[PDB]
Amino acid sequence: GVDPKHVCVDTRDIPKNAGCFRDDDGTKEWRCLLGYKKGEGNTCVENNNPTCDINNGGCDPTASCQNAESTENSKKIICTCKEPTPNAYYEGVFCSSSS
């Protein structure tokens, strides 16, 4: 999709168990770590059953997800950043302007 160059600067909107990201829009985003999900309320927690498509399984829409099962929720879903992607934050929960 788009180029991760979105970087991140402030990310105060960014809850716990959530990685920090900024979008091209200027809006600072957050996502829920690999195999995580929103639990608290605008917040991320360990999702003991991660599925792809939904939260991308805790991955970034540019990061190609894989839906899988494992003892660890954060060792289930696989995210893939590519050449057209400056970075992959939190293993690929996001993609930023490299790191």
Side-chain angles (χ1 to χ4, degrees):
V2 58
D3 284 72
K5 49 83 71 182
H6 300 201
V7 313
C8 78
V9 180
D10 173 88
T11 55
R12 292 176 182 199
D13 195 69
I14 284 51
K16 89 177 301 185
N17 304 285
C20 61
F21 186 58
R22 196 137 188 190
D23 182 66
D24 290 300
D25 177 88
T27 299
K28 325 153 202 169
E29 294 192 290
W30 52 283
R31 296 172 173 72
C32 349
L33 255 40
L34 303 186
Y36 286 54
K37 75 185 183 191
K38 305 225 289 301
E40 321 289 78
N42 287 335
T43 341
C44 311
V45 291
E46 253 171 78
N47 175 28
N48 284 216
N49 190 26
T51 183
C52 59
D53 279 276
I54 302 172
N55 192 33
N56 209 38
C59 300
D60 183 279
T62 60
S64 180
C65 56
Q66 135 159 150
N67 180 22
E69 275 288 77
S70 278
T71 186
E72 300 293 76
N73 359 94
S74 46
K75 301 204 176 63
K76 299 186 198 187
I77 310 297
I78 283 80
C79 32
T80 279
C81 64
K82 306 180 66 184
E83 186 183 286
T85 65
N87 189 32
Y89 246 85
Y90 285 89
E91 314 279 273
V93 185
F94 323 74
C95 294
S96 199
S97 191
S98 54
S99 296

